[PDB]
Design a protein around this ligand. Sequence first.
Ligand SMILES: Nc1nc2c(ncn2[C@@H]2O[C@H](COP(=O)(O)OP(=O)(O)OP(=O)(O)O)[C@@H](O)[C@H]2O)c(=O)[nH]1
Ligand SMILES: Nc1ncnc2c1ncn2[C@@H]1O[C@H](COP(=O)(O)OP(=O)(O)NP(=O)(O)O)[C@@H](O)[C@H]1O
Ligand SMILES: [Mg+2]
Ligand SMILES: [Mg+2]
Lengths: 393, 181
Amino acid sequence: SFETRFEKMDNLLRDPKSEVNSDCLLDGLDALVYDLDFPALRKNKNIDNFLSRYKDTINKIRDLRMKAEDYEVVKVIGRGAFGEVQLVRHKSTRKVYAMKLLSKFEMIKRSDSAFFWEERDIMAFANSPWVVQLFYAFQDDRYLYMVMEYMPGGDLVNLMSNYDVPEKWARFYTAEVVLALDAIHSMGFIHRDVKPDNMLLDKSGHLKLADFGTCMKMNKEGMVRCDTAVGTPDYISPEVLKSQGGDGYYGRECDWWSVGVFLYEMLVGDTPFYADSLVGTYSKIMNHKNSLTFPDDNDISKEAKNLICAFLTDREVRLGRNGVEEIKRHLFFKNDQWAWETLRDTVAPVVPDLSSDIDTSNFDDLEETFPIPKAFVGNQLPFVGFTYYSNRR
Amino acid sequence: QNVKCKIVVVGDSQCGKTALLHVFAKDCFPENYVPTVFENYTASFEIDTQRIELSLWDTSGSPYYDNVRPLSYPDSDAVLICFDISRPETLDSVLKKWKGEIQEFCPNTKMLLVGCKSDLRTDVSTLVELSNHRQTPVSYDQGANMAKQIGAATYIECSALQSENSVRDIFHVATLACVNK
Ligand SMILES: Nc1nc2c(ncn2[C@@H]2O[C@H](COP(=O)(O)OP(=O)(O)OP(=O)(O)O)[C@@H](O)[C@H]2O)c(=O)[nH]1
Ligand SMILES: Nc1ncnc2c1ncn2[C@@H]1O[C@H](COP(=O)(O)OP(=O)(O)NP(=O)(O)O)[C@@H](O)[C@H]1O
Ligand SMILES: [Mg+2]
Ligand SMILES: [Mg+2]
């Protein structure tokens, strides 16, 4: 009728999962008045005697919406693709989050103006203890921002280089991944970039994942169509690889393979398909039935070398092909130390040694721009709807 | 104009060079062996969304032609040195002759060891025959432990005959040797 109009409507400006919750319409305008504030463009009286209309409020506003310098920063604990990731303390709230920055200019040059929207959903909406909580997501003119709960444990690589991982342990860190993946599968998706660089540790010693650029909601029947290669090249699936230029079409067995390559980097110290060359590490993978090989070690328990070889294999054969369940059942997770629903409940294998609200001991240490629009570019564009706060009870 | 890389193939006679360039660039395995000489297959590949254009060069392995084969090296982007997995004779040859003749005409060009006819490694016939000479087919390790001793970028195998993909998986690996540069 009519009430259920101005009704079904209002609960669509609050709905965060919406394309238009207030915070998004904002994000809209803000990002437009950025793309018309040019002398070039105002030779036209539409732009000029409109941007005039909204000067004295478009200013009054960028002043409020969680602006970037609301945060002062501690250490920078990660550079990467597009810009860095810093450990920040909120100048007001005194709370410590871990801010991800995205270089806007360099993100439209590398022609990836949207690979993150799934990382927004996942991080902020899959309420999970396997997922790194996304607390606020705000933008300005030059960059993007994602304020994430901070993980003082470090990546898994900081670990494998500072300890010589035992099987007792590779049983743990592995099955805590297996869980955090069947998480992200039955949240609808598929990860694809599955490496120790992307596994962090909460102050409790247990594990969470971050970086979800690569992700992608599976179609109706469980697969995906994609003709581009993705993820670090040591851990890359053979299906995800030979897709690079070809009718690539894969399920979620491609996260599974990545896991075997990890159960290996842990128990042997180097990766299973290493090679000098970007192209040399790809040829080891291709010839996997022939190139995979363990050193002069038979201390590698029979049933561990035996799991690695069930993941590292053709996709139609690969363990997990017929259920995330036949994985939990491997003779390799036998132990008087637990069963599964209690895993992140138990006590870590290695527990982080921290001194203060922000000890980055487990971490190591570390202005281009735009062209003034002739006509109307539309740069600040598919960066809209990206804002999201918390408040929601 | 789309990116265009040039690719040359050398190797002992009958190792299966023309078996494979014909499978990849013409989608059918050759019915009758004929000692190729020069021949210019014209293929096309795809890395990540975009087209590379491929110009392939088949050659002779016969010493009779040691004098002419080197007219194809000039300005290559990537060369494929070959050996027949069912004859260790032809690998002690990717060392005697081919490392040297490639090192010297296309020196500033990625080279790349490829073992052909891999499907014969499990044929009771070409074993029963290789033992009647105190020989025994080339094992993957015998293969790479050669390639990394002659300076190849990677070693890779393929049954030019059995599964079509084993060959695509080759021109995939080597498109990348051209373009990655
Ligand atoms: N099983 C198997 N047989 C092959 C394969 N490749 C070639 N052959 C056989 O071996 C013969 C040699 O193949 P070719 O490639 O045409 O000969 P070539 O290597 O070009 O030798 P050249 O005279 O120097 O050009 C062919 O008649 C095929 O019957 C292969 O990959 N697997
Ligand atoms: N929520 C977090 N808490 C603590 N450290 C983090 C967090 N998120 C990212 N890091 C660190 O930043 C590194 C890489 O993070 P990421 O944002 O994924 O960079 P990247 O651009 O994805 N690198 P690439 O694989 O080439 O795309 C990790 O190895 C961590 O050390
Ligand atoms: Mg990373
Ligand atoms: Mg021939």
